[PDB]
Design a protein around this motif. Structure first.
Motif, PDB file in Angstrom:
ATOM      1  N   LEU A  99       0.844  -1.211   0.000  1.00  0.00           N
ATOM      2  CA  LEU A  99       0.000   0.000   0.000  1.00  0.00           C
ATOM      3  C   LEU A  99       0.876   1.256   0.000  1.00  0.00           C
ATOM      4  CD1 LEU A  99      -2.541  -1.514   2.403  1.00  0.00           C
ATOM      5  CD2 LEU A  99      -3.270  -0.239   0.401  1.00  0.00           C
ATOM      6  N   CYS A 100       2.205   1.127  -0.075  1.00  0.00           N
ATOM      7  CA  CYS A 100       3.024   2.358  -0.258  1.00  0.00           C
ATOM      8  C   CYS A 100       2.827   2.897  -1.682  1.00  0.00           C
ATOM      9  CB  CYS A 100       4.492   2.099   0.049  1.00  0.00           C
ATOM     10  SG  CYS A 100       4.806   1.859   1.815  1.00  0.00           S
ATOM     11  N   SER A 101       1.907   2.278  -2.426  1.00  0.00           N
ATOM     12  CA  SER A 101       1.334   2.865  -3.663  1.00  0.00           C
ATOM     13  C   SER A 101       0.261   3.896  -3.309  1.00  0.00           C
ATOM     14  CB  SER A 101       0.784   1.798  -4.567  1.00  0.00           C
ATOM     15  N   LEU A 102      -0.019   4.063  -2.021  1.00  0.00           N
ATOM     16  CA  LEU A 102      -0.882   5.177  -1.571  1.00  0.00           C
ATOM     17  C   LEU A 102      -0.019   6.187  -0.805  1.00  0.00           C
ATOM     18  CD1 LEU A 102      -4.088   3.319  -0.363  1.00  0.00           C
ATOM     19  CD2 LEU A 102      -3.544   4.197  -2.623  1.00  0.00           C
TER      20      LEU A 102
ATOM     21  N   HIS B 198     -10.996   6.851  -1.778  1.00  0.00           N
ATOM     22  CA  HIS B 198     -10.849   7.903  -2.780  1.00  0.00           C
ATOM     23  C   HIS B 198     -10.274   7.356  -4.079  1.00  0.00           C
ATOM     24  CE1 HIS B 198     -10.156  11.727  -4.674  1.00  0.00           C
ATOM     25  NE2 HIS B 198      -8.888  11.402  -4.851  1.00  0.00           N
ATOM     26  N   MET B 199      -9.187   6.585  -3.984  1.00  0.00           N
ATOM     27  CA  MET B 199      -8.536   6.074  -5.184  1.00  0.00           C
ATOM     28  C   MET B 199      -9.467   5.147  -5.954  1.00  0.00           C
ATOM     29  SD  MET B 199      -5.740   7.650  -5.355  1.00  0.00           S
ATOM     30  CE  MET B 199      -4.067   7.247  -5.843  1.00  0.00           C
ATOM     31  N   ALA B 200     -10.298   4.381  -5.241  1.00  0.00           N
ATOM     32  CA  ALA B 200     -11.305   3.557  -5.901  1.00  0.00           C
ATOM     33  C   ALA B 200     -12.301   4.414  -6.671  1.00  0.00           C
ATOM     34  CB  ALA B 200     -12.028   2.689  -4.869  1.00  0.00           C
TER      35      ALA B 200
ATOM     36  N   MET C 195     -11.695   7.397  -8.028  1.00  0.00           N
ATOM     37  CA  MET C 195     -11.019   7.966  -9.224  1.00  0.00           C
ATOM     38  C   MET C 195     -10.855   6.878 -10.287  1.00  0.00           C
ATOM     39  SD  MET C 195      -9.722  10.272 -11.070  1.00  0.00           S
ATOM     40  CE  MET C 195      -8.916  11.759 -10.485  1.00  0.00           C
ATOM     41  N   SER C 196     -10.463   5.685  -9.870  1.00  0.00           N
ATOM     42  CA  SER C 196     -10.289   4.564 -10.817  1.00  0.00           C
ATOM     43  C   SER C 196     -11.615   4.295 -11.515  1.00  0.00           C
ATOM     44  CB  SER C 196      -9.760   3.359 -10.106  1.00  0.00           C
ATOM     45  OG  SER C 196      -8.418   3.558  -9.705  1.00  0.00           O
ATOM     46  N   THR C 197     -12.710   4.342 -10.775  1.00  0.00           N
ATOM     47  CA  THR C 197     -14.055   4.078 -11.334  1.00  0.00           C
ATOM     48  C   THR C 197     -14.403   5.181 -12.326  1.00  0.00           C
ATOM     49  OG1 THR C 197     -14.667   2.754  -9.446  1.00  0.00           O
ATOM     50  CG2 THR C 197     -16.492   3.732 -10.680  1.00  0.00           C
TER      51      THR C 197
ATOM     52  N   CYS D 106      -6.292   3.179 -18.689  1.00  0.00           N
ATOM     53  CA  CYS D 106      -6.336   4.216 -17.661  1.00  0.00           C
ATOM     54  C   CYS D 106      -4.962   4.834 -17.451  1.00  0.00           C
ATOM     55  CB  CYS D 106      -6.866   3.642 -16.348  1.00  0.00           C
ATOM     56  SG  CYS D 106      -8.640   3.353 -16.331  1.00  0.00           S
ATOM     57  N   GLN D 107      -3.924   3.994 -17.385  1.00  0.00           N
ATOM     58  CA  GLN D 107      -2.574   4.501 -17.176  1.00  0.00           C
ATOM     59  C   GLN D 107      -2.112   5.339 -18.359  1.00  0.00           C
ATOM     60  OE1 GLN D 107      -1.263   4.399 -14.242  1.00  0.00           O
ATOM     61  NE2 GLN D 107      -3.211   3.401 -13.778  1.00  0.00           N
ATOM     62  N   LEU D 108      -2.458   4.917 -19.580  1.00  0.00           N
ATOM     63  CA  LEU D 108      -2.106   5.705 -20.758  1.00  0.00           C
ATOM     64  C   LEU D 108      -2.745   7.089 -20.703  1.00  0.00           C
ATOM     65  CD1 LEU D 108      -2.389   2.828 -23.385  1.00  0.00           C
ATOM     66  CD2 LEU D 108      -0.289   3.970 -22.651  1.00  0.00           C
TER      67      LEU D 108
ATOM     68  N   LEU E  46      12.120   2.971  -9.181  1.00  0.00           N
ATOM     69  CA  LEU E  46      12.295   1.517  -8.943  1.00  0.00           C
ATOM     70  C   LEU E  46      10.919   0.854  -8.941  1.00  0.00           C
ATOM     71  CD1 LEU E  46      15.142   1.219  -6.292  1.00  0.00           C
ATOM     72  CD2 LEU E  46      15.218   0.985  -8.777  1.00  0.00           C
ATOM     73  N   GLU E  47       9.852   1.624  -8.717  1.00  0.00           N
ATOM     74  CA  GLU E  47       8.478   1.065  -8.816  1.00  0.00           C
ATOM     75  C   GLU E  47       8.109   1.045 -10.298  1.00  0.00           C
ATOM     76  OE1 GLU E  47       5.938  -0.455  -6.971  1.00  0.00           O
ATOM     77  OE2 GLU E  47       4.889  -0.401  -8.897  1.00  0.00           O
ATOM     78  N   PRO E  48       7.848  -0.132 -10.936  1.00  0.00           N
ATOM     79  CA  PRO E  48       7.609  -0.184 -12.381  1.00  0.00           C
ATOM     80  C   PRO E  48       6.566   0.810 -12.899  1.00  0.00           C
ATOM     81  CG  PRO E  48       7.861  -2.412 -11.621  1.00  0.00           C
ATOM     82  CD  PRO E  48       7.800  -1.529 -10.401  1.00  0.00           C
TER      83      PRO E  48
ATOM     84  N   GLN F 296       0.826  -7.507 -12.616  1.00  0.00           N
ATOM     85  CA  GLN F 296       1.305  -7.302 -11.253  1.00  0.00           C
ATOM     86  C   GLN F 296       0.299  -6.506 -10.429  1.00  0.00           C
ATOM     87  OE1 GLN F 296       5.382  -6.011 -12.976  1.00  0.00           O
ATOM     88  NE2 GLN F 296       5.896  -6.574 -10.862  1.00  0.00           N
ATOM     89  N   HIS F 297      -0.318  -5.486 -11.035  1.00  0.00           N
ATOM     90  CA  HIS F 297      -1.245  -4.639 -10.290  1.00  0.00           C
ATOM     91  C   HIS F 297      -2.508  -5.401  -9.907  1.00  0.00           C
ATOM     92  CE1 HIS F 297      -4.844  -1.989 -10.301  1.00  0.00           C
ATOM     93  NE2 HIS F 297      -4.104  -1.240  -9.505  1.00  0.00           N
ATOM     94  N   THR F 298      -2.994  -6.274 -10.793  1.00  0.00           N
ATOM     95  CA  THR F 298      -4.184  -7.062 -10.480  1.00  0.00           C
ATOM     96  C   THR F 298      -3.954  -7.942  -9.258  1.00  0.00           C
ATOM     97  OG1 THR F 298      -4.979  -7.055 -12.766  1.00  0.00           O
ATOM     98  CG2 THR F 298      -5.742  -8.849 -11.334  1.00  0.00           C
TER      99      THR F 298
END
Ligand SMILES: O=S(=O)(c1ccccc1)N(Cc1ccc(-c2ccccc2)cc1)c1ccc(C(O)(C(F)(F)F)C(F)(F)F)cc1
Length: 275
Positions: free
Chosen positions: A47-50, A83-85, A87-89, A125-127, A161-163, A247-249
């Motif tokens: 979760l250090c992706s948050l 919140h991130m959920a 935005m992703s939605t 989404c990432q693009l 270093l985080e892909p 990896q993200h899934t």
């Protein structure tokens, strides 16, 4: 030179993009905000992706700023997940509308539409997020929202270093055009290798045509020595995005197993049945 079919392909994709990509995020409203076994939990430190800072600039001129906590061995690491959920939605809905406006996508069997969307939604989404990424400030500028990367001990090198973050910085450095981004979205969306795709041959031939158009577009519009091998650099970026997607899934499903947070649309796109 670009053929008329290639020019029509790009215009169809470009029109789909402008109709379904709100680059100012003006319709992202009513989103949640953070408040005012053991090895499962240990890898859940992903979760250090948050570790993002949040800014909200009001139309009145006021500014709200959120600095996330530090892991103290508790539930405070989930504070940014709702919140991130949301935005992703919002982003996922834009990606879905994008695909549905494309004639090539509309003509596919509905089962293959679902299979392609489930396979590529995160990648598209990432693009789209890359186009609002500020590589100088390390912030995703989403209209009145800004998502700033929090200062790490290693600084920029540690973040690369985080892909996912390396993809964003590397893709941004290629200085692509809007047309090249939308062709990347098409190539990612029409991927024949996705689970559950029935019309594998149609999807593959469509992907090949999008790739030739991108190759030709670059050749016709970018003669500069800096853009030599640009087509091949883009193709490898998309191959890496598929690995980051996979990896993200897995990361997402592990967090969901411990602390459920996924919205209904995310559950649908990730296969979570509700049972
Ligand atoms: O693509 S993003 O810009 C984006 C997507 C959606 C909305 C806004 C921004 N992004 C940035 C992002 C990506 C990775 C990292 C990072 C930093 C250091 C170490 C490890 C990693 C930081 C920020 C990102 C992607 C996925 C996710 C999630 O699915 C969520 F939170 F939505 F659930 C995950 F955390 F579960 F994975 C959350 C942020």
């Amino acid at each position: 030179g670009l053929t008329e079919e290639q020019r029509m392909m790009i215009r169809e994709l470009m029109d789909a993009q402008m109709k379904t990509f709100d680059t100012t995020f003006s319709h992202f409203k009513n989103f949640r905000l953070p408040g005012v076994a053991a090895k499962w939990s240990q890898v859940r430190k992903d979760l250090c992706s948050l570790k993002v800072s949040l800014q909200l600039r009001g139309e009145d001129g006021s500014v709200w700023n959120y600095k996330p906590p530090a892991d103290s061995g508790g539930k405070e690491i989930f504070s940014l997940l709702p919140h991130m959920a949301d935005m992703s939605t919002y982003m996922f809905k834009g990606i879905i509308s994008f695909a549905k406006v494309i004639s090539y996508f509309r003509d596919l069997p509905i089962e293959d539409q679902i299979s392609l969307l489930k396979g590529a939604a995160f990648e598209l989404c990432q693009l789209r997020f890359n186009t609002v990424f500020n590589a100088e400030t390390g912030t995703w500028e989403c209209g009145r929202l800004s998502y700033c990367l929090e200062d790490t001990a290693g600084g920029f090198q540690q973040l690369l270093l985080e892909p996912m973050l390396k993809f964003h910085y590397m893709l941004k450095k290629l200085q692509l055009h809007e047309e090249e981004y939308v062709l990347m979205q098409a190539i990612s969306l029409f991927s024949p290798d996705r689970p559950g795709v029935l019309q594998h041959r149609v999807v593959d031939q469509l992907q090949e045509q999008f790739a030739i158009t991108l190759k030709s577009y670059i050749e016709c519009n970018r003669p500069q020595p800096a853009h030599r091998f640009l087509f091949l650099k883009i193709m490898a970026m998309l191959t890496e995005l598929r690995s980051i997607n996979a990896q993200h899934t897995q990361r997402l499903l592990r967090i969901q197993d411990i602390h459920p947070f996924a919205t209904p649309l995310m559950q649908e796109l990730f296969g979570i049945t509700g049972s």
